[PDB]
């Protein structure tokens, strides 16, 4: 169920934050403007950390091979990525960032 990630102001616009989860695969929380999104942190094309990539609009570019994903739908935006990223809806209440426990 929902996990408290951080205060909205803890992230500058256009930045990415990695969220480690004990016993689980890490997640990546993106701040596009004033909006927040989250996906699995590991690129589906390899072992790269998307949180160490480049964000352009709502598209995250993997730092390894240039593959890319739409941080909202999790669908590939650029090759060689073909496997859709797991998306996690995020909630922002009272200046606090929350990311769902499961996908969807």
């Amino acid at each position: 169920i929902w996990l408290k990630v951080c205060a909205a102001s803890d992230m500058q616009p256009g930045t990415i934050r990695r969220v480690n989860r004990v016993g689980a695969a890490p997640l990546a929380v993106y701040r596009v403007g004033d909006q927040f999104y989250a996906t699995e942190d590991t690129c589906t094309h390899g072992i790269a950390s998307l949180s160490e990539g480049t964000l352009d609009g709502d598209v995250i570019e993997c730092p390894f091979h240039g593959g890319a994903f739409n941080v909202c739908t999790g669908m590939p935006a650029s090759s060689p990525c073909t496997v859709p990223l797991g998306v996690f809806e995020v909630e922002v209440k009272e200046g606090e960032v929350y990311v769902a426990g499961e996908k969807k």
Binding site: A25, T42, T44, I47, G66, S78, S79, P80, V83
Partner: protein
Amino acid sequence: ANVDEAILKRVKGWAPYVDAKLGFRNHWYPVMFSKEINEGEPKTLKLLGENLLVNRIDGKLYCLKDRCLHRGVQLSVKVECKTKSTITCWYHAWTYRWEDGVLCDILTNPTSAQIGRQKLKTYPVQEAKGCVFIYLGDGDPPPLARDTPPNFLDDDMEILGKNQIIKSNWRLAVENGFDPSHIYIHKDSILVKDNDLALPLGFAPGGDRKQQTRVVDDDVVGRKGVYDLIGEHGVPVFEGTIGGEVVREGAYGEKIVANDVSIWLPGVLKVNPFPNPDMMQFEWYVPIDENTHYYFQTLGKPCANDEERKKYEQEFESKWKPMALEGFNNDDIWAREAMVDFYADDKGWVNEILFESDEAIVAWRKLASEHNQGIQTQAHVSGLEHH
């Protein structure tokens, strides 16, 4: 994509065909005979520029791309099938299921996050008439009937054949086979004399342009092809003259063959009847890479019982195969190879000077351009790209 855009721009009637040097994607293609692949003995081959692996498990055929997802090596360099349903890469042991290509295990790291999250490309494979067909395409395949000439799949049709690799682009092969006037190169074939065939040197066209061919845009199964009707209103040429003097004659045999000749997508010719009044020939020109193709020949004959089939198989091995498939078609092989240089730089597609009988070829190029199911690109081979 595959050809200089300045050239494609000039070819308004069939640019896609000229662009299709690697062949048409999303079509079925015969690549070998059933007897060539046995239980648990994977076989390699290249189709449309792609390296593939075919295996037979519990009687059924499966096809996997022969390129490991990890570092791109061909799995076939050192085959390792450690369980009946899988194949393990010899390099870092990534293991894939023949069934769906899913990466089910990694012996070097059983806890890898990649397990169950990657999939090696697979292609549908179907056996029919003793022939192995592979659907080199994406998504659910259409019926095999769509990509085969009429009657090839008939219940009582007995199919026997031969396959080999020829050094020429597949299109040169298709055009040579469907070329009404190329019959000239067969004037001295042993089959003509030894099987007493009637064979003109060519044809003096008759009637209008549209009467020269019959395009089939749709069949009951979605077939797309063209029939050569040059002999419908045309005059068979039996004596060749130069300056009014006879310098060559056609063959005045009694057997009338090649009543109808038709070419069908993705590139298979049907000559009926041939090489004997009671048989028919179906041959594919399968793209292997830009410079080579499989010349997959088959001869069919209706057979009711097992006795006739036996007899037919005997006749095939002792007469038809050596006298027709080789004695007749061997000249087509070097004729195809002779056109390689002119088209190799793609300039031949602009500089060729066509004459009347070529209406058949033009009809094929247009039909192919309008009804093919996709152009294979080098990107399909190395990995699709889109930024």
